Amino acid sequence: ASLTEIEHLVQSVCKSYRETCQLRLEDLLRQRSNIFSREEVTGYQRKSMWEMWERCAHHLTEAIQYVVEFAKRLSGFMELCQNDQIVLLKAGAMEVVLVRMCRAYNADNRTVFFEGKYGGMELFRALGCSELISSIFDFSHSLSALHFSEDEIALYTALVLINAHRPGLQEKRKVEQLQYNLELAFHHHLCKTHRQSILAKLPPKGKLRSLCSQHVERLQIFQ
């Protein structure tokens, strides 16, 4: 409830993000001028569907591990029972990784950083999931227009994970209290930075979960 407590939560959220964000934003930004040549692009397109899914499933799985570390460094999260930790991470972790991808997305030319250089959608053609790739590019383009800071990303992804509506929770009221305090931390932070305007602009509920197709499920077969 307290203002000092709310400030402590904000620093808690931002600290854990800063240590689990995986790639440094200043490196991502420095590399925007480094674009795959047409020859390097064609090299990705000549991958087999399986080879290209093995590569992307490696990335997705790596990124989930970091989101799991992110959650476990939040003080309120380890207080929850382990069942509820599982239910939240299972239902929310892939959605956080998708949000985290907006940092690798350069809205200026509609390219994404991938394995060392920026490339267009055509780079993922060998997945055979054009619709999906397109939908992900359009979602990142939406988030990039908000000019999220690292702190704002940290707080937003916290609210993706800490959702009292996930079915299967056995201490619903605990996660509700946590969700409410995180909403207060988010709103408080945005007021102190005069950035409350973004709340109206956030992607609507459901559209982010709409991203997660079965294309990105059952990835164990890829090793």
Ligand X SMILES: CN(C)c1nc2ccc([C@](O)(c3ccncc3)c3cncn3C)cc2c(Cl)c1-c1ccccc1
Q: What is the binding site for ligand X (CB under 6 A)?
A: 22-23, 56, 59-60, 63, 100-101, 104, 112-115, 124, 133, 136, 216
Cβ atoms of residues 155 and 99 within 8 Å: no
Cross-strand partners of 111: 106
Residue placing its CB nearer to ligand X in the complex, 139 or 186 = 139
Q: Between the CA of residue 133 and those of 117, 121, 123, 129, 179, what are the distances in Å?
A: 17, 7, 10, 6, 31
Up-side HSE of residue 29: CA atoms within 13 Å toward CB? 4
Q: Cβ 142 to ligand X, closest distance in Å? A: 13
State which residue, 74 or 133, has the beta carbon closest to ligand X.
133
Answer positive or negative: Cα dihedral of 115, 117, 121, 126: negative
Q: Give least dist CB 215 to ligand X, A.
A: 7
What residue spans of 21-81 are helical by DSSP H? 25-30, 38-45, 49-72, 75-79
Which residue's CB is nearer to ligand X, number 44 or number 77?
44
Q: By C-beta, is 100 or 175 nearer to ligand X?
A: 100
106 strand-pairing partners: 111
CA atoms of 208 and 139, how far apart (whole Å): 8
Query: Closest CB to ligand X among 114 and 187?
Result: 114
Shortest reach from residue 46's CB to ligand X, in Å: 17
Residue with Cβ nearer ligand X (100 or 189) = 100
**Minimal distance in Å, beta carbon 145 to ligand X?**
17
Least distance (Å) between residue 134 CB and ligand X: 10
Helical H segments across the chain, by residue range: 3-20, 25-30, 38-45, 49-72, 75-79, 82-100, 130-144, 150-161, 172-192, 197-201, 207-211
